[PDB]
Amino acid sequence: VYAWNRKRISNCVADYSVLYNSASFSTFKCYGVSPTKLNDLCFTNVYADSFVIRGDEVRQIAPGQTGKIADYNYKLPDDFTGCVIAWNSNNLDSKVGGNYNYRYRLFRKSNLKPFERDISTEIYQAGSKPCNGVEGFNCYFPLQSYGFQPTNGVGYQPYRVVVLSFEATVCGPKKSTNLVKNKCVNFNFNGLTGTGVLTESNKKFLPFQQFGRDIADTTDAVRDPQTLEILDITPCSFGGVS
């Protein structure tokens, strides 16, 4: 948790409903945006902060919280976009007799700033003496070790927690239907909204350009961004009646 791993996620397409519906995660509640509607919103860069804590302080992974972990290992801002995924890892992160690789900042000089990294294992100064790099009275090691057993209580078990923080490229999935031919549809291709019937065409589009156009510019032809075939667009049958 003190060497919390941060991954930049940029220039891709992110899927968030697969994380929401997996049901393998014990705590999944989101601040700033609902988990359903953060798939149709999107951002510039996505930060994934992964660590392993004890499960009894998972309330400390929240905006504006107090405790050892929130103030000395990983601090959240109050204006936090993104949220927290928490799930048990007792069959992997906990070993019989104690898995002690995971450490946390028990002592520090002050509280953290939001998103601050601390790796320094310099000897702490509880009192007043030159500790000079060695351990002794009031000169403690600032990191305390997690004790993980497979026989302990459920909140006193190792929990994997990954926090996603938001801030424009990283935008999610997109699909609705099939393509619909010879019927009046009010289509939406990449953002261009038009109404008309889509037909098989003979217009040999060159491989780079996307959609057609004519004299007195109207988007009369389109290639789909989907399967790459060519579709005429005809206006939807608008004649007057007498």
Epitope: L106, R108, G127, S128, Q149, Y156
Partner: antibody, heavy 117, light 108 residues
């Protein structure tokens, strides 16, 4: 020199208010982890409150809302203001330096408060 | 919370008999126990931390161990300065509850 010398005890009415102090020696009150503990006869030694570097004030569920702690940063002193004292609050109060929230490293001499009619 | 109970609440033991003190923890803690000694009008020192380690200057007389629901402190040769109050305290549950005290004296 490790010293934790305490003051503020005395006889008060049930329903009165008083104020404690714990002068510390050679270490910082506002930057170390310490705790207020009580001992009464017949009952065991009991944790009341704990206070962090800056941090948060953590109380017992029995005394939550009644006691308050306000450390004063002019010197190495730790206070506790006692309001709405019940009849069961006859105890000697100790300021004890902790190793975070694990174990009591050092203790004071305690100041004993007796509340009665 | 863990409410502490000392079963040998008062034990009068000859000057050197390897006396046995104990407590039970009403909940399940693995080895989360520390043993304390309060002398007469003095500061209550720690004796044992983690239920298996002697902290600082704690001799080989003290062989306290135990787990889960039964914890036992062993005092070996019993100088008269060990006639004191023996506490046992857990690490796991907030709020922290001390032991009720074991009154050990040496018969003269």
């Amino acid at each position: 020199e490790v010293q934790l010398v305490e003051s503020g005890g005395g006889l008060i009415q049930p329903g009165g208010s008083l104020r404690l102090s714990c002068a510390a020696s050679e270490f910082i009150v506002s930057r170390n982890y310490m705790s207020w503990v009580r001992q009464a006869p017949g009952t065991g030694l009991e944790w009341v409150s704990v206070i962090y570097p800056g941090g948060s004030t953590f109380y017992a569920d029995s005394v939550k809302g009644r006691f308050t702690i306000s450390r004063d940063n002019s010197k190495n002193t730790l206070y506790l203001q006692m309001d709405s004292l019940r009849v069961e609050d006859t105890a000697v109060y100790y300021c004890a330096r902790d190793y975070g929230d694990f174990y009591f490293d050092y203790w004071g001499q305690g100041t004993l408060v007796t509340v009665s009619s | 919370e863990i409410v502490m109970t000392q079963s040998p609440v008062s034990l009068s033991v000859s000057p050197g008999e390897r006396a046995t003190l104990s407590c039970r923890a009403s909940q399940g803690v693995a080895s989360n126990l520390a043993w304390y000694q309060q002398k007469a009008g003095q500061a209550p020192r720690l004796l044992i931390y983690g239920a298996s380690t002697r902290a600082t200057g704690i001799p080989a007389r003290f062989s306290g161990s135990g787990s889960g629901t039964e914890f036992t402190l062993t005092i070996s040769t019993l100088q008269s300065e060990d006639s004191a109050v023996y506490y046992c305290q857990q690490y796991n549950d907030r709020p922290r509850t001390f032991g009720q005290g074991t009154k050990l004296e040496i018969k003269r």
